[PDB]
Amino acid sequence: GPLGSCGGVGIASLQRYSDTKDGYEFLYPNGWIGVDVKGASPGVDVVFRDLIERDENLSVIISEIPSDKTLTDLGTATDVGYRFMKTVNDASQGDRQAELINAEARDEDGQVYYTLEYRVLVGDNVERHDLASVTTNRGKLITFDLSTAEDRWDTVKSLFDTVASSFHVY
Helix, strand or coil: CCCCCCCCCCCCCEEEEEECCCCEEEEEECCEEEEECCCCCCCEEEEEEECCCCCCEEEEEEEECCCCCCHHHHCCHHHHHHHHHHHHHHHHCCCEEEEEEEEEEEEECCEEEEEEEEEEEECCEEEEEEEEEEEEECCEEEEEEEEECHHHHCCCHHHHHHHHHHCEEC
């Protein structure tokens, strides 16, 4: 049914991206460019940058979880939340500091979704707020790291969660 068709299906609007290999798919606005970051931080696969808004940056990290332990076994929302801070700080523990705002998890359709909320501090001021969500699918580790200016973060607060939650796996 959803075989689709080859044609000018792509229009000046929202685009759909899917990957059978990673088993994940999400929507994103047009005007965005994909940059290759092979050999980057472990798990890092591809990064998306919005030409329209240089300030706004999105990063995608894909990794495989050990069959012996799952997202739940790995750690709790709070535990994983703290681990993530150390992971990021490991390379940014010099001048910038990562603060964990909150961390919660939800269970729907038998699928567990982990939500991580944190912000980046510089010197004596907040640099920006970033939302990160973690979810496993068939042993595939999928993370959605979105970053946006604090000036409108409140206005588009749901936007970050929406994109991360909008994602689908298969």
